Amino acid sequence: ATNFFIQPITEEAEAYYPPSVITNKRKDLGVDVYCCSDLVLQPGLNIVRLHIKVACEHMGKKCGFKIMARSSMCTHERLLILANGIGLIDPGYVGELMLKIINLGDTPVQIWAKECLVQLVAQGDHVPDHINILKRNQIFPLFAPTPR
Amino acid sequence: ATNFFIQPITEEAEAYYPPSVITNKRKDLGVDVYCCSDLVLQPGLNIVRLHIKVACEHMGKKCGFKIMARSSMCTHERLLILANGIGLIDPGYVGELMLKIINLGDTPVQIWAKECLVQLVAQGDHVPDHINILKRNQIFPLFAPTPR
Amino acid sequence: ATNFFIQPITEEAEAYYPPSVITNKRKDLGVDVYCCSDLVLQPGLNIVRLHIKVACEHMGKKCGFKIMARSSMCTHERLLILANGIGLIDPGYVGELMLKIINLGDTPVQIWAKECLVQLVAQGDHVPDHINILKRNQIFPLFAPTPR
């Protein structure tokens, strides 16, 4: 099976990520993740913190996953693109998820909290089976760094 | 096996999509789709209609597919990019395919009909086996909406 | 298994690609490739030659692979993006690898040799097992063109 594990880092993110074990019944390939804070995107590159730690497992083994823009991220009011096309995250990374978002416009752009700009897709485009939202400071073995 | 199903919506698109069952002998991963109309791309975001309905099947089950730019889309004469890197389409969608194309230049850009700017790639990068072009108003069960 | 094969074309690229058979022990999905020459990226589209020939094999059969930007390519000092989101290369191509890189800034950008801007990922996001660096003018059967 293919399972995702998301743990909020800040207490602000915990309001959007309450603990549960969602079964992905409707076969949605992507896992939407929230902007847990209001943010102003200046023209050019922006580093957007997602306030979450993510691990994805395939066949009982930790695997990589992809960060992809949602159709909602780019509109006529805000020309936003992911800087690196799609973000690849290796299974060894156990830190906070960060986005590189380019504001192609010439004026600052405001994004509001609860807005989902990106989605997480597992390596090989495997549809997830469960999406576990772990509580804030649960010590999870998949989030322990393992220098190779 | 992996099979694609394309049905033109307009009669203008039918000239470019005549009915047949192509066997993908040459293992081409992508399925080119035409701009069935001349269009002017203003600077910034553009919504480009593709005048087709698409379904993709893997192992007898409906799956998702990806919209990806072709190497031909961006040239020195026209700075065009897909707005969301690559477009993900869930298997439940049975509507017309739409592109979000960003014109990064400062002057309008003209695209002519028959030009193929994007290609369709199945979930998991599975090379297709057949590419079925269904006639305009054939009622196909894979194009019937099924609210989940 | 999944194996990559890289052969430098120029003698300048050979300094960065010395011959060996690396076993991908640390399960890195991507294969970093170097800019083997200093280059100036003008605003707009740039054609960047990588001075390498690449073949990727999956289950003893030649397959396609994807060119993806690294997190290092886009920074606050240089707004660079791959023009076509991610580059798809069909298994039939046996020529030199070329990048379409868009400089979104208004002033030229300098990239230095040994800098890795992109990475190669196999079709289906299969983690490689070996990364073979073939010497400059070894005649390899996977690099012989086979018109289909």
Residue numbers in the entry:
A (entry chain A), B (entry chain A), C (entry chain A): 2 to 149
Sentences from the paper on this structure:
It is indispensable for reproductive infection of ASFV in swine macrophages, the natural host cell for the virus. We show that E165R is a homotrimer and can specifically hydrolyze dUTP.
The structure of ASFV E165R was solved by molecular replacement, using the structure of P. falciparum dUTPase as a search model, to a resolution of 2.30 Å, with Rwork and Rfree values of 22.2% and 25.5%, respectively. The structure is a closely packed 3-fold symmetric homotrimer, with one E165R trimer in the asymmetric unit. There are 447 visible residues (residues 1 to 149 of the total 165 residues in each subunit) in this structure, which account for 90.3% of the intact protein, and 16 residues at the C terminus of each subunit are missing due to the poor electron density. The E165R protomer in the trimer is mainly composed of β-strands. One α-helix (α1) and two 310 helices (η1 and η2) appear after β1, β13, and β14, respectively. As calculated by CASTp, the solvent accessible area and volume of the binding pockets in apo-E165R are 249.3 Å2 and 163.2 Å3, respectively. Only their C termini show obvious conformational differences, suggesting high flexibility of the C terminus of E165R.
